[PDB]
Write a protein that binds this ligand. Structure first.
Ligand code: MG
Ligand code: MG
Length: 260
């Protein structure tokens, strides 16, 4: 262990998206995750998942218009019906692709706008997602994003994500503990992993501080893995990093930790 999932939106980008499933399997991954599958039919993706015997661990609700500065519609006042549409489409994909969880994106708060109003809207949209997903035994994830990656995003600290989930008050809503953002904003990863065990349903990793391979940087990942084992984490660890160079050329860390 741990159980690693390759993030196809960041890894194996040398080839077209649809070809990354085979690339991940060739490297030895049993699961994959990515951001947005919407430009492809559920049939297209399902075929690649089955062909390569892969588990789809996670994906996101749509970002909206990225070039207009959007990164989620669920926290945007007046866009609630579009957010619900994004949530419903994600459910359609999650059902067809046998994916247990979806990260419902919040959104960027325009300068001058009241963040509280956006937060209230986000909480109601997460409750909507939670109630739509519960009957199918699926869950909803909330991911804090560091400012270096997404300026002015609704929330950047794991503690803000945790408080939001606590207020959402749903048994199938959890945070997405991306250690890259956590180390950039909060630190004390042991406290988050150990004392909030049960509150995060997914984990992601990347090397600090440049977000490349996880076998170097200020965080000693092998030690973190021991912690995850201790607390009995049973989910997947998404490898969401930008390879320093060619994806394959930087997979030494994987062979080591998976072969051990
Ligand atoms: Mg992430
Ligand atoms: Mg801090």
């Amino acid at each position: 262990m741990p159980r690693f999932a390759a993030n196809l939106s960041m890894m194996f980008t040398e080839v077209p998206f649809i070809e990354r499933f085979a690339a991940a399997r060739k490297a030895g991954f049993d699961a994959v995750e990515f951001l947005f599958p919407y430009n492809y039919s559920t049939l297209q993706i399902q075929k690649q998942l089955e062909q390569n015997h892969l588990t789809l661990a996670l994906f996101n609700t749509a970002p909206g218009d990225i070039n207009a500065g959007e990164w989620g519609l669920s926290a945007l006042p007046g866009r609630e019906h579009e957010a619900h549409a994004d949530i419903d489409l994600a459910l359609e994909y999650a059902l067809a692709l046998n994916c247990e969880q979806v990260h419902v994106m919040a959104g960027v708060v325009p300068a001058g706008e009241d963040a509280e109003r956006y937060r209230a809207v986000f909480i109601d949209n997460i409750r909507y997602a939670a109630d739509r997903f519960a009957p199918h035994g699926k869950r909803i994830l909330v991911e804090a994003l560091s400012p270096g990656v997404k300026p002015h995003y609704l929330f950047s600290s794991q503690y803000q994500a945790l408080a939001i989930v606590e207020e959402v008050a749903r048994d199938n809503v959890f945070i997405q503990l991306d250690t890259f953002h956590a180390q950039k904003v909060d630190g004390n990863l042991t406290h988050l992993i150990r004392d909030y065990a049960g509150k995060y349903a997914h984990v992601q990793i990347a090397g600090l501080p440049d977000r490349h391979e996880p076998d170097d940087g200020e965080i000693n990942y092998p030690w973190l893995f021991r912690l995850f084992d201790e607390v009995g984490y049973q989910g997947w660890i998404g490898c969401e990093y930008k390879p320093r160079g060619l994806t394959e050329e930087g997979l030494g860390w994987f062979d080591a930790w998976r072969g051990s």
